[PDB]
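Postdoc handover notes: sequence design on the structure in folder B. Input tokens:
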């Protein structure tokens, strides 16, 4: 499993949640302010 432990830190996030990675992918896009639309 990859819900904690075994994560394999990829030099850019450890825990690496897959649902939180879509929320982190989400916010990754929305880390500008007005450059999404």
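Designed sequence:
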């Amino acid at each position: 499993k990859y819900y904690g432990n075994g994560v394999h830190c990829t030099k850019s996030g450890c825990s690496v949640n897959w649902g939180e990675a879509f929320s982190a992918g989400v916010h990754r896009l929305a880390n500008g302010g007005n450059g999404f639309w």
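Context for whoever picks this up: The helical segments are 19-29. Don't rerun without checking with the PI first.
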